[PDB]
């Protein structure tokens, strides 16, 4: 069944899910702490998500931008209101589409400001991977950002509040505030990529609320749809003066409402603490982690000196123990589970994680 | 209800569809000859499409590229086989994503051939709108294409077999064959954008089969999913040596099978003829069309000299008569209905089209 990949990754074919459990094509049960890389915020087979998809599926899937339908219009209004900054939203099909629109919008805004072509530079950060016309500097380095903006050629700073792929590195205290302040001083836009950190995952619906900044643009991907293909670019007043389909929108309206709830934000803190406690117990036994970092349910367990580079090997042992989880570079285990993962699912996932690390050490 | 567009087109909110009929939020019934701009090839609420979506919706929506699921692997195998040229397929979320991957692949291939940066030019054609590093020439002009490739700096020619937006202008006889021959002589790739003309719409599953050429890449959009968000880049042997989700894939497998059927190809020719006959009857009465052009169910009625520029005004009258249809520039009415549109749906659509043109002329 996996031999048809010569036409198209861990050699595991997934068949069905329920919450934070997934079963492969052979009936093996896995605890899922990856949630499709921070996508399935309500786990698999959420009753409200499936009901919404089924209900819209019997009505109308697609209009094109030539005609209107109601779910996208309501989602546009609900997402703009939820964001607490945006005036307009561009609905699209993926985070890649959203980030591309955000970049094009930076350029259109810059030219509308009278910036010549050599003064539309976008600063991005090493470890994040969006992006000529780009300038790469180190994350969390305010002195380096100040230097990089000194020439006046920068039109936007674009960043993730937490660098998911880059070791689950969160913005340090005050960092986004300093970016905001520097963007203001240099008349540049602040673009926040909330594709992984957004949709409730850090414990607030939008991650940057905890950084206490107001951005000019925010991008979102299919976490907005709880796993249904969608993306969005949210635009604040500076750039609003510069589409979607009913199937994705009907589902995203349910995802957006549930993922904004106090219940979800509650579980995020509860299970963040529970995972952090479990990592600490695992660490005291085996000395495998140097630190745990991140926010809410976007966590990175940093492997200790004696385990540098072993993330992939540990992931292999985790699959062998019935646990699906991620890495974030070769030195960090990344955990981005569904935001409604239960106590019992966390407990079993932690049990399997410990088994995996124990097996890795025993095999060395 | 349409006042929430200050957050996000014809001022018509569509609610539900059945085949080639759609109803707006007020219960008005429309004949649909636009099919979401050549997207809903099986019309609205196709039983097989909805059944497939419902069945997959209860299992698993999303894996990420870190894990496998079965529907994408089967779709990859089925699409590669159906294409009669491809060796590999890249599954994505939209035609915009597919065309971007095709362009990046042209560049990677060109560099892997040792082409310096000034010799990776992509020729595209005026009227088509994909696309620095691009060279724009007139469609259907073999002498101009020969001249544009003479310097040896072109890495690919990228074209639609029919220019949907550009007046529904089909490739003239032998044109793609001449492009293929010139690409071969200059060691360049042939990339065919089948987003609008593909998925059975011209009467064969792939439009370029009727041009009797073998391309190096083909791109497809959400017509592959019958209206579910999806896209694909199909790669032949020259570039195969250089993802997807189970929800889109489960639906696209049903769309791909039905849209390849002899029944659908039969209806395309039958209703193409029926639409062409109707346009001719309308034309004799009112003298409104200079010609009808296109292939199968991708048709453009070219407005006559006395109606130059009036496409949009006629579209407005069509909506007032309960008909949704498109234009293709200001001088052409474009018709891209569902490929399983029935005799009775065509007849009623033609009745309303005539009413619309009659009203336009009576109002002048």
Automatic annotation (TrEMBL), chains A, B:
It comes from the Bacteria. May also have succinyldiaminopimelate aminotransferase activity, thus carrying out the corresponding step in lysine biosynthesis. Pathway: Amino-acid biosynthesis; L-arginine biosynthesis; N(2)-acetyl-L-ornithine from L-glutamate: step 4/4. It holds the Pfam family Aminotran_3. Binds 1 pyridoxal phosphate per subunit. It is found in: Cytoplasm. Keywords: Amino-acid biosynthesis, Aminotransferase, Arginine biosynthesis, Cytoplasm, Pyridoxal phosphate, Transferase. Homodimer. This is Acetylornithine aminotransferase. Belongs to the class-III pyridoxal-phosphate-dependent aminotransferase family. ArgD subfamily. CDD domains: OAT_like. NCBIfam families: argD, PRK01278.1, PRK04612.1. It comes from Stenotrophomonas maltophilia (strain K279a). GO terms for biological process: L-arginine biosynthetic process. Its EC number is 2.6.1.11. The keyword Amino-acid biosynthesis applies. InterPro entries: AcOrn/SuccOrn_fam (IPR004636), Aminotrans_3 (IPR005814), Aminotrans_3_PPA_site (IPR049704), Class-III_PLP-dep_AT (IPR050103), PyrdxlP-dep_Trfase (IPR015424), PyrdxlP-dep_Trfase_major (IPR015421), PyrdxlP-dep_Trfase_small (IPR015422).
């Amino acid at each position: 069944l996996i031999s048809l990949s010569h036409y198209y990754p861990r050699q595991v074919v997934l068949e069905r899910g329920q919450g934070a459990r997934v079963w492969d094509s052979q009936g093996r049960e896995f605890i899922d702490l990856a949630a499709g890389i921070a996508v399935c915020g309500l786990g698999h087979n959420d009753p409200d998500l499936v009901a919404a998809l089924v209900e819209q599926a019997g009505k109308l899937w697609h209009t094109s931008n030539v005609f209107y339908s109601a779910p996208p219009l309501h989602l546009a209004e609900e997402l703009v209101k939820a964001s607490r900054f945006a005036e307009r939203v561009f609905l699209c099909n993926s985070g890649a589409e959203a980030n591309e629109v955000a970049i094009k919008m930076v350029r259109k805004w810059a030219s509308s400001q009278g910036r010549p072509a050599d003064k539309r530079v976008i600063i991005t950060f090493r470890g994040s991977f969006h992006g000529g016309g780009f300038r790469y500097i180190d994350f969390n380095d305010e002195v380096q950002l100040e230097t990089a903006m000194a020439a006046g050629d920068v039109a936007a700073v674009m960043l993730e509040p937490i660098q998911g792929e880059g070791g689950v590195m969160p913005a340090k205290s005050g960092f986004l505030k300093r970016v905001r302040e520097l963007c203001d001083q240099h008349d540049a836009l602040l673009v926040l990529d909330e594709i992984q950190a957004g949709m409730g995952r850090t414990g607030t619906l939008f991650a940057h609320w905890q950084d206490d900044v107001v951005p000019d643009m925010v991008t979102l991907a299919k976490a907005l749809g709880g796993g249904f293909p969608i993306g969005a670019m949210l635009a604040g007043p500076k750039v609003a003066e510069t589409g979607g389909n009913p199937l994705a929108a009907a589902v995203a309206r349910v995802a957006l409402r549930k993922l904004a709830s106090s219940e979800i934000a509650a579980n995020v803190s509860r299970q963040s603490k529970a995972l952090r406690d479990g990592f600490a117990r695992i660490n005291e036994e085996f000395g495998v982690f140097s630190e745990v970092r991140g926010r809410g349910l976007m966590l990175g367990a940093v492997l200790s000196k004696d385990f540098a580079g072993q993330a992939g090997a540990i992931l292999d042992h985790a699959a062998g123990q019935g646990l699906l989880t991620l890495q974030a570079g070769p030195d960090v285990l990344r955990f981005v589970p569904s935001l409604n993962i239960t106590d019992e699912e966390v407990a079993e996932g932690l049990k399997r994680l410990r088994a995996a690390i124990a097996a890795f050490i025993a095999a060395r």
